[PDB]
Structure 1
Amino acid sequence: NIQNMSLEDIMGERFGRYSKYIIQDRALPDIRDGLKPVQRRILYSMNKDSNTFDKSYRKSAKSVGNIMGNFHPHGDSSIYDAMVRMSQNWKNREILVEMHGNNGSMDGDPPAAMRYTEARLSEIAGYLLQDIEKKTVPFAWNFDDTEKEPTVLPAAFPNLLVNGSTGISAGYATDIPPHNLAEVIDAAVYMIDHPTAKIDKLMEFLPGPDFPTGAIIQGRDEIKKAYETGKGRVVVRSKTEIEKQIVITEIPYEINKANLVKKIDDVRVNNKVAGIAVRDESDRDGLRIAIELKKDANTELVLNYLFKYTDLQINYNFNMVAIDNFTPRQVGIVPILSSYIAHRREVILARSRFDKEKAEKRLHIVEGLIRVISILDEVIALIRASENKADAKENLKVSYDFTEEQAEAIVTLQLYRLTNTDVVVLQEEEAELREKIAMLAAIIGDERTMYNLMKKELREVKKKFATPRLSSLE
């Protein structure tokens, strides 16, 4: 047996398969929850295993094993390395994982081996997962068909813009700068009300990136270009002070403090510029790089040179590419924001639909017990005169035409439950349910009532997690 295939065609399929899997499944973030698969699987798994901010930490390696075993058929290092990135405040604006021990740093030192460290999900992360358990989101089978896995998260906040993301696949790469959770949500809410929103106005809310590493960002013009088109180049300058000596207390995002320092001193030794005279004195709680100068305090020339010749000033590039509709799009702020909004809509509606059914069920059951409490004597008498649990059930259905579930509920009632015969209490819950159901039915078919609830939850999230800007605009 042999199938004969060409080189062109074989190369064709085999490439197409991979190129696709890479784009969707590996590198590129979903435009909805702004996560790559590994990220999502880590989050879901940790949370399912209730490994959460409020409870004790847990041996990273145990976490990694479970992810690998249940959801993610790949290297441990790929997984844990990714998990670790999510614990890095100089990398992410709003961290989704808290790790206790050594998880690297700005000097670039390598994260401690996984067998050493311990991890949990952060607080805001829970918000990414909020409502997951109330059928709010599409599930798929895992690779084994053994257990079910979310295809996207609920997403209480617009993670995509908040923590940015990068970014290397076949044919596509992505870079998305972090943003100020507060400011982002502002943009979101504004759009929720005025959908036909122009970028200029949105910019009043989201005025450009917010790097966790602080720093100065200059390039209003190109930032707009980025927000409209999806591509742009911006300038980022470390933040400088002069002491009577040059003090550095913020550096450009994605830049390596350690090497940055060597490269500067290399300037001195090569005496590539005048007054070069360089020390790093940084400790747990503050960044400090001291460039202390000699005689001819040509400092302005020296500083201006350093900006040009070293990575004290660099440019950051925007390549905002996410997966929308199962496909690679290069998108601006408007598509991201919009698509996030429309997502939250599906979420809210799906949630409420689930909540409503649950309400209606217990309601039908409560409606039931209320009837029973009136016939209790004769009801029990029947149950006793019955042969089997099942026969017991079948007799109530026949006689007092109760329903099926109503029957199981009456029958399985324990005994001390009879200690509480009181149609008032049940009636109290009955009101409660009826009011919830009617509230929900509104959201479901009330489009503006729906959008308002969105706006509220969003505002509530802003209040909880909002923080001052770290990066400045020039």
Structure 2
Amino acid sequence: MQLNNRDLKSIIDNEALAYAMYTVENRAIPNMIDGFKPVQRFVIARALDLARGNKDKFHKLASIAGGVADLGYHHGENSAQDAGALMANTWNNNFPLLDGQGNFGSRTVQKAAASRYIFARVSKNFYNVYKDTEYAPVHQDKEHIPPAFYLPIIPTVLLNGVSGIATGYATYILPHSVSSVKKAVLQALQGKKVTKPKVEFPEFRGEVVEIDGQYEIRGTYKFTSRTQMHITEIPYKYDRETYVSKILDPLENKGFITWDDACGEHGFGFKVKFRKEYSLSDNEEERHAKIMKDFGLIERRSQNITVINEKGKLQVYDNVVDLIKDFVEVRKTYVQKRIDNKIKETESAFRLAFAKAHFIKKVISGEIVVQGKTRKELTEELSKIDMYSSYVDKLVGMNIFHMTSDEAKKLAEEAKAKKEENEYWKTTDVVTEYTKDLEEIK
């Protein structure tokens, strides 16, 4: 009957900070290294687990959302469904990490279909960028099967763009173009002056300009006549419904215009008829400014780069250049870890292959008589040799056809190639093996 004296202080301070840990586990702030919110990370891990067998097999998004509970997710399946829907579609991401089949929405309508009808899979982008998954840090909580963060080649957080609201913090990173981010990371690897990555929204035919530290998202319009205008593009945050309701509905009510819907496959589009009540200035620039103002074709956005670093601590970056520098600095350590582990694996593989080739060579000519013996006796007489020390089980467990001449030559060539690969891994560094990997993404 162990009666403790924990008081009310300890009870209340353990009831509290437990909610803090619970909300830290699922915090909307995206991790800097991998660019995943916790829900997105769990969805990606579940998709990888499903696609372990067949890489190109599409799985129902309902299955993906329901599988995250086994991995460690706590906030149900609706959040996983939303994360999968927002990650699969190409209208929301420059670098979609989930190839999707079904109705994931578009710019005109951003609502995805029901998760029980739409399919999803990990795309070739994920395998092109998200490498060295085996070396990702193990989560502190053993229940979290997905690692703490994956190890992408480039800072994915800058590619698809992340927006979220947290208690006391707000994150908003504009989606940057993949090519410019790759160039910036390549420059940071070699220590050159890194150019600021160009922000490019996905499936956006408009104009983006950087003014006084603010990004002005400008749409494009062309005039078909004196009183007829055809909008070709609109700012990103509008879909057809909200743009129509908030811009063209009141102006039509005001009687200024009688708009015509013309959105199609080529993004957005709006044919607008100008009435006599509306006043158009004869000057070109004044009319352009008025049109961009009233129609809401100019949008200003400010980046609030708050990301979780590799140590689990919330970090605020003034600009994306410092974030890229820190990301490359962190990724260099994991590249070095890959170098070391590859060196070890190649050394072991070469030793095993050389042992196999020499066993075959001894067999074919005259040396090791497997032709009648005891299995344990054969193991002892071929393990007394120092070179076949710890490889007896693999070396005896070889196949019959290896004793032919062609397979003997193949084994010798494989051993030589393993030696060459081990030498290549030994005589290479982080810069070379990172620049080589930064040449396959597209």
Normalising to structure 1: TM-score of the pair?
0.81
Preserved CA contact (<8 Å) 1:23 1:328 = no
2:91 is equivalent to residue 90 of structure 1: yes
2:121 is equivalent to residue 136 of structure 1: no
Cα distance in 1 for residues equivalent to 2:128 and 2:53: 12
Match of 2:331 in 1: 344
Preserved CA contact (<8 Å) 1:106 1:258 = no
Q: Which of 194, 219, 227 is the equivalent residue of 1:238?
A: 219
Match of 2:264 in 1: 283
Preserved CA contact (<8 Å) 1:99 1:120 = yes
2:200 is equivalent to residue 210 of structure 1: yes
Matches within 5 A, 1:29-428: 29-50=30-51, 55-108=56-109, 110-132=111-133, 135-140=134-139, 144=143, 148-194=145-191, 197=193, 202-203=195-196, 206=197, 208-212=198-202, 213-222=204-213, 233-244=214-225, 245-271=228-254, 275-295=256-276, 298-299=279-280, 304-305=289-290, 307-309=292-294, 311-324=296-309, 325-331=311-317, 332-376=319-363, 381=369, 384-386=372-374, 389-398=375-384, 400-420=385-405, 424-428=409-413
- Cα drift, residue 34 of structure 1: 1.6
Match of 1:471 in 2: none
Higher relative contact order (CA 8 A, sep 6+): 1
Q: Unaligned 5+ residue runs, structure 2?
A: none
Where 1:218 maps in the other structure, the secondary structure is strand
Deviations 1:428-467 (A, max 9, x none): 2222122211211122xxxxx4213322321332xxx1xx
Q: Structure 1 residues 220 and 424 mapped into 2: Cα distance closer, same or farther (>3 Å)?
A: same
Q: Structure 1 residues 143 and 354 mapped into 2: Cα distance closer, same or farther (>3 Å)?
A: closer
> Which stretch shifts more, 116-125 or 245-254?
245-254
2:433 is equivalent to residue 453 of structure 1: yes
Where 2:27 maps in the other structure, the secondary structure is helix
More helix per residue: 1
- Cα drift, residue 323 of structure 1: 0.6
Where 1:175 maps in the other structure, the secondary structure is strand
Preserved CA contact (<8 Å) 2:107 2:267 = no
Preserved CA contact (<8 Å) 1:52 1:122 = no
Cα distance in 1 for residues equivalent to 2:249 and 2:409: 82
Match of 1:226 in 2: none
Cα distance in 1 for residues equivalent to 2:78 and 2:142: 19
Match of 1:5 in 2: 8
Where 1:292 maps in the other structure, the secondary structure is strand
Q: Give the AA of the match of 1:76.
A: E
Match of 1:227 in 2: none
Preserved CA contact (<8 Å) 2:32 2:155 = no
Cα distance in 2 for residues equivalent to 1:54 and 1:414: 30
Q: Give the AA of the match of 1:288.
A: G
Preserved CA contact (<8 Å) 1:218 1:234 = yes
Q: Structure 1 residues 236 and 359 mapped into 2: Cα distance closer, same or farther (>3 Å)?
A: same
Deviations 1:234-288 (A, max 9, x none): 32222111112222222222223312112223333442xx843422222344321
Preserved CA contact (<8 Å) 2:222 2:230 = yes
Q: Structure 1 residues 364 and 236 mapped into 2: Cα distance closer, same or farther (>3 Å)?
A: same
Preserved CA contact (<8 Å) 1:53 1:121 = no
Instruction: Say how many residue pairs are matched.
Output: 429
Q: Unaligned 5+ residue runs, structure 1?
A: 223-232, 444-448, 466-474
Deviations 1:397-429 (A, max 9, x none): 23x445343211221112222234775443322
Q: Give the AA of the match of 1:347.
A: Y
Percent same amino acid at aligned positions?
22
Cα distance in 2 for residues equivalent to 1:4 and 1:142: 28
Preserved CA contact (<8 Å) 1:100 1:119 = yes
Q: Give the AA of the match of 1:202.
A: T
Cα distance in 1 for residues equivalent to 2:334 and 2:188: 18
Q: Structure 1 residues 370 and 57 mapped into 2: Cα distance closer, same or farther (>3 Å)?
A: closer
Q: Structure 1 residues 34 and 144 mapped into 2: Cα distance closer, same or farther (>3 Å)?
A: closer
Match of 1:468 in 2: none
Where 2:99 maps in the other structure, the secondary structure is strand
Cα distance in 1 for residues equivalent to 2:142 and 2:109: 35
Cα distance in 2 for residues equivalent to 1:190 and 1:237: 29
Cα distance in 2 for residues equivalent to 1:269 and 1:392: 93
Where 2:208 maps in the other structure, the secondary structure is strand
- Cα drift, residue 182 of structure 1: 0.6
- Cα drift, residue 390 of structure 1: 4.5
- Cα drift, residue 159 of structure 1: 0.8
Q: Give the AA of the match of 2:338.
A: R
Where 2:438 maps in the other structure, the secondary structure is helix
Q: What RMSD, in angstroms, separates the aligned Cα atoms of the two structures?
A: 3.0
Deviations 1:199-227 (A, max 9, x none): xx623xx2x421123432233321xxxxx
Preserved CA contact (<8 Å) 2:71 2:146 = no
